[PDB]
Structure formats: C-alpha cells, structure tokens
Amino acid sequence: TARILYDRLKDSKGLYVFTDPSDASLIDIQELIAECPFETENSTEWAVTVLYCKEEKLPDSIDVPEPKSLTARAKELTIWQDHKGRDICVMLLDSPDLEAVNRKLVSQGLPHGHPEYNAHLTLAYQFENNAAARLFIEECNQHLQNYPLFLTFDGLKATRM
Ligand SMILES: C[As](C)(=O)[O-]
C-alpha cells in the first residue's frame, strides 16, 4: 500500500520512484542466486527503479498511479557496464505493470532518465566476469526458463533526486 506522495514532493528538483520486492519475492531471489560465486547487493538494497526523473520543475499536480498489485517476471540475468565501464550483473524484468506505471508518470510530464524504460533489478554493481560467474549466469538463465519466476512488489515509493 506504499504509494507516491506527490504533493509532498511536487516542489522537489527531480523525482525518484522505486518499488521493493515482497517478502516472498525477496526469498525467491535469494534462493535463485544461492549458488552465486560473486558478492551481490544485499536483500535490503534490492530495488526496482520505476522512474528516474531529473526534471527540476515537476508538474504541480498529476494523476498518481496507485496500482493495486505490481508483478514482474524474472526474465534473465545479464551483464551491463557502468560509467567507468565496470561490469554490472542485473536481473532483467518483463513487467507490463511497471512499464504502465512508468508510462503513466512520463506521459504526465515526468521524463525518465533513459530513452526507454528497462525494468531491472541490479544484483551486483562491481563484478568480475570469470568462468564461475559466467557459468552461474548461464545456469540461472536456464533455471529462469525452466522454472518461471514471478516477483511481486509491495508499493510505489517516491523520493527526491
Ligand atoms: C531497497 As529497500 C527500500 O527494501 O531497503
């Protein structure tokens, strides 16, 4: 039932909206990555960005989404690179729910910080892609295909920045 408290934030410079995995989904993610050979963000850090908005003049009002359930399918793990070209392990999410929330925010004058919204959950921000890590990612993606994993998120949480 966590929700975007827009009017408390309407006068901020920028808007960050994220959602947190449910208790059950936290346990599901932990069991998914049980055999991971590299260190990962801990369970308190796992969050899914829904809006990264650097607009300094936010709209005065909006139609706030307030979805009733937030679901996503854990599609796969893949490797991204950060500013300094360091490897990042992220969990790609297939989520019509989160796409819809992001679209609802962007269409009302809240621009997202990337040309397309890519729902994902970052699992490791600094990551040595070695044979063990690659085997882990491969087996996890095969597991994600053989056993569909759906995640649920509890609310929408908004902060400045
Ligand atoms: C990523 As959190 C808001 O569950 O500490």
> Which residue ranges make up each domain of the chain?
6-159
Q: How far apart are the first and last CA of the chain?
A: 22
- Residue for token digits 């993610």? 29
- Tell me which residue has its CA closest to atom 4 in ligand 1: 44
Nearest to 21 by CA among 120, 130, 129, 159: 120
The atom number, within ligand 1, closest to the CA of 20 reads 4
Indicate which atom in ligand 1 lies nearest the CA of residue 157: 3
Q: What is the fold, at CATH topology level, of the domain defined by 6-159?
A: Cyclic Phosphodiesterase; Chain: A, (3.90.1140)
Residue 29's closest CA among 17, 18, 13, 44? 44
160: alpha, beta or left? (left if phi > 0; alpha if psi -120 to 50): beta
Residue 38 · residue 128 · CB < 8 Å: yes
Please give the resolution of this entry in Å, rounded to 1 decimal: 2.0
| Sheet with 48-53: strands ordered across | 48-53, 15-19, 157-159
Method: X-ray
